[PDB]
């Protein structure tokens, strides 16, 4: 049946296989007519040099412009022949190439895919075309303020590290960019073991690995500095002013990463548009709906390899900024001391739900593996996560937050019309309570 | 585990159930009441009603309710369209009973407290606004007016003089007017039938009254052009399509994948769509065209929604429209259709494979049929489409009253008379 305890038990397990040249193989059988076929690569900007900045990004567009065996636009005209959707995306710490398809024609898929991974048509026809679009887009990118401030955010904490740099990289490089340097980075980091392969669907493990089928896969990092600081772009014309505030935290692999998953879930989030009103349990969603001290906000977590990011992102009236803050320091600080096991539970349940929730669907299932592999390896400790949940304690959360919050140096990002936002020296004194 | 179990009642309300093994345990509740069921003085009610969700039941204080779902970790959802409003809820495998019980109290036990009703007046706009970020959003709503007179022309949103207009009572009737155990349909997912089967008949048997079908929507075309400040003018051309649940509805559902391009590849301008290609070739710098097909119970519409720049729109329309002619003239490619069939079958299954989506697909059949059809049968029926069908299907869109909606800078914007 479906019973939460038993519900953990029966799942198609993590599968693993390993080829010779460093390629990884892995899978899970969902008993489904379709398969998400995907690839994840750990080559980052944090690898990329100061010219390489944004190049792999530029590269990202290029694969589908045609390849070695398949010149321009002969690539997709086979793809859509099957009717199988196709997509690719990249990230500072990862890049994921993947396919969503019926399990039938997969024998082509990976072979199609394998061609793309390395064999590529590097043709300055596409280059200039793509060189333009990016440049076109580079300027357009000022339209979504969200992404904008984060760029500021990293650079202010991680200054002096390749991690602190634009994903697309600065503009002039893209013009200056030449496809030989690509071929470098093409050759550099697209080797295995850097490469990793997974999939999920009706696919069985060995019927994956057999048709993982002989093609090829392949043949530097530093701990980053953390900057107590501030950045402000003051532009007063705009109606609203985003805010972001955070402190650094543990990397991907680390015990406490889960212990802090809940504190966010507990403190929760608010938005203009909820039907929750003023009776919600989250003090923030109660007040921020009550006096509409903000339009909305949400809290984030991002844990890098060695690093982690805890903080929120809010939007409030140009006269309402201060009061959002003096509230927001309330919640974190009060947790570190006076918190209680009751509210723990309501946080505990949610994260269980959110965990179980995201686990439906081919691609997301497929998608965990790749990062997880590049992160914890094969580990998909599904039922364990539950056991992991049972670990967390009142002291734990307090003792955890005591570390990473009380009397620390926070980072401050801002975007105009900021001006109200108090000076740092307030925020700093505002981190540690005086016992009030 | 166990496959689809759907059960007629004496009330006729289908209680459909499956058994899962998953700890995710969800339930959903469908209702026939859409915007078409609002009257001239009843306007926006459902849209307002759709914000009646969180309010004070007759079974409990809304406070307790709201603090209830969170501390449990469950989640509530509400959804409507021009036709079928749907009340969705989910939580862990174990605790559904507490939650499930509250699903009733809301739909079972209404209370409209004149004070509690007032605070929701401010809310509509801020909701109503954010939907109109997307220009296409505003464009669509206008369209149902142009092509109809009465029913589907009804907005999903509140015309603004209608704002202060709505009393608890007006709601209160439409509550019980359009509610009946004949129309109500309940769907389980992860929970055994008998538990589902138990409480279903218990509370949910009320009347009667039902269902006010006097809206045939009376397709009546026309065109509407709003003068606006966008650089990218938006427009669409529609000759009425057929009713839902028909090979024609499939034929157009096939006919779309002919021209209709959703990207199957990121950033890829879809070449297999002749539409964009046959356009983009004779055409110039950025634009987009996609084919729009949608059907409701009694009927639906087929069209294509264009996005172009100031001068281009007409030729953007015209060529594409002229390109439509090409198809209507006896142009055919069986493999393309075949590939399109492959697209559709996949696209269908890829659509359906999603449980939550399929969760709808369950009751989307129910209020429509009340039975279940394996997608295999669909996939079979997908095959059943003849080409001359899709041939003459497009011919219809050419062969019949067509309608336009346009908004932006209109200086160069042609009418349908230019067409």
């Amino acid at each position: 049946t479906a019973t939460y305890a038993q519900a953990l038990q029966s799942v198609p397990e993590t599968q693993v296989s390993q080829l010779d040249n460093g390629l990884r193989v892995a899978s899970e059988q969902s008993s489904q007519p379709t398969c998400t076929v995907g690839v994840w690569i750990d080559a980052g900007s944090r690898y990329e040099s100061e010219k390489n900045n944004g190049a792999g990004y530029f590269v990202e567009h290029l694969a589908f412009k045609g390849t070695k065996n398949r010149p321009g636009n002969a690539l997709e005209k086979e793809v859509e022949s099957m009717g199988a959707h196709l997509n690719a995306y990249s990230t500072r710490e990862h890049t994921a190439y993947y396919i969503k398809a019926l399990s039938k024609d997969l024998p082509k898929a990976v072979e199609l895919l394998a061609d793309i991974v390395q064999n590529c048509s590097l043709e300055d026809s596409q280059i200039e075309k793509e060189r333009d679009v990016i440049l076109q887009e580079l300027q357009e990118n000022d339209t979504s303020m969200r992404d904008v401030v984060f760029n500021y955010l990293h650079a202010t904490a991680f200054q002096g590290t390749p991690l602190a740099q634009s994903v697309e990289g600065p503009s002039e490089n893209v013009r200056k960019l030449s496809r030989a340097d690509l071929t470098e980075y093409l050759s550099r980091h697209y080797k295995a073991p850097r490469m990793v392969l997974a999939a999920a669907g009706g696919l069985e493990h060995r019927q994956l690995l057999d048709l993982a089928q002989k093609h090829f896969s392949g043949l530097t990092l530093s701990p980053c500095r953390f900057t107590g600081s501030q950045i402000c772009h003051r532009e007063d014309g705009l109606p609203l002013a985003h805010v972001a505030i955070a402190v650094e935290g543990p990397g991907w692999a680390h015990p406490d990463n889960v212990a802090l998953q809940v504190a966010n879930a507990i403190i929760g989030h608010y938005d203009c548009t909820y039907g929750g009103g003023a009776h919600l349990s989250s003090p923030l969603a109660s007040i921020a709906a009550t006096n509409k001290l903000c339009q909305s906000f949400q809290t984030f977590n991002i844990c890098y390899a060695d690093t982690g990011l805890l903080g929120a992102h809010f939007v409030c009236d140009h006269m309402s900024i201060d009061d959002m803050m003096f509230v927001l320091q309330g919640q974190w600080m009060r947790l570190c001391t006076s918190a209680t096991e009751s509210e723990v539970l309501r946080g505990k349940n949610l994260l269980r739900n959110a965990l179980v929730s995201h686990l439906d669907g081919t691609t997301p299932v497929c998608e965990d593996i790749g990062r997880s592999l590049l992160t914890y390896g094969r580990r998909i400790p599904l039922a364990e996560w539950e056991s992991r949940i049972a670990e967390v304690d009142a002291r734990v959360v307090r003792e955890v937050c005591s570390k990473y919050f009380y009397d620390q140096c926070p980072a401050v990002a801002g975007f105009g019309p900021i001006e109200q936002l108090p000076d740092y020296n307030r925020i700093r004194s505002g981190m540690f309570w005086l016992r009030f | 585990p166990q496959d689809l179990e759907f059960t007629r009642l004496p009330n006729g309300l289908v209680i459909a159930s499956l058994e899962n093994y998953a700890p995710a345990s969800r339930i959903g509740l469908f209702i026939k009441a859409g915007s078409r069921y609002e009257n001239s003085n009843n306007l926006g009610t459902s849209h307002l009603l759709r914000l009646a969700s969180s309010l004070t039941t007759k079974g409990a204080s809304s406070f307790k309710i709201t603090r209830g779902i969170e501390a449990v970790g469950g989640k509530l959802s509400v959804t409507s369209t021009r036709e079928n409003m749907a009340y969705t809820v989910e939580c862990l495998r174990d605790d559904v009973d507490i939650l499930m019980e509250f699903l009733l109290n809301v739909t079972t036990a209404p209370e409209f407290r004149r004070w509690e009703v007032a605070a929701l007046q401010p809310q509509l706009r801020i909701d109503k606004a954010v939907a109109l970020q997307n220009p296409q959003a505003h464009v669509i709503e206008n369209l149902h007016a142009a092509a109809y007179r009465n029913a589907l022309a009804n907005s999903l949103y509140c015309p603004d003089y209608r704002i202060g207009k709505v009393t608890p009572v007006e709601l209160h009737d439409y509550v019980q007017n359009h509610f009946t155990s004949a129309r109500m349909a309940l769907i389980g997912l992860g929970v055994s039938h008998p538990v589902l089967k138990q409480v279903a008949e218990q509370f949910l048997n009320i009347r009667g009254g039902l269902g006010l079908s006097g809206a045939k929507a009376k397709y009546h075309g026309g065109e509407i052009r709003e003068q606006n400040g966008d650089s990218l003018v938006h427009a669409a051309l529609v000759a009425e399509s057929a009713a839902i649940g028909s090979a024609e509805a499939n034929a157009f559902s096939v006919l779309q994948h002919v021209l209709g391009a959703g990207p199957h590849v990121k950033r890829g301008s879809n070449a297999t769509s002749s539409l964009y290609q046959a356009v983009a070739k004779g055409v110039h710098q950025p634009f987009d065209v996609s084919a729009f097909n949608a059907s409701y119970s009694d009927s639906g519409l087929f069209g294509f929604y264009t996005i172009s720049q100031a001068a281009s729109a007409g030729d953007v329309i015209k060529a594409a429209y002229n390109q439509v002619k090409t198809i209507a003239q006896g142009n055919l490619s069986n493999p393309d259709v075949q590939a399109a069939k492959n697209k559709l079958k996949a696209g269908y299954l890829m659509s359906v494979e999603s449980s939550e989506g399929f969760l709808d697909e369950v009751g989307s059949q129910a209020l429509a049929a009340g039975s279940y059809t394996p997608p295999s049968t669909v996939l079979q029926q997908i095959d059943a489409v003849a080409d001359a069908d899709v041939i003459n299907a497009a011919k219809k869109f050419v062969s019949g009253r067509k309608s336009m909606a346009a908004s932006g800078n209109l200086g160069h914007t042609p009418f349908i008379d230019e067409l």
């Binding site: 548009t273 | 969700s53 996609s290 949608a294 639906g300």
Partner: peptide
């Protein structure tokens, strides 16, 4: 022309902001 997944549009309000559709 977007139905694009499905027939016409959508609206949803519960908590988390909202959703549109085609």
């Amino acid at each position: 022309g977007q139905a694009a997944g499905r027939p016409l549009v959508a609206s949803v309000s519960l908590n988390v902001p909202a959703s549109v559709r085609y």
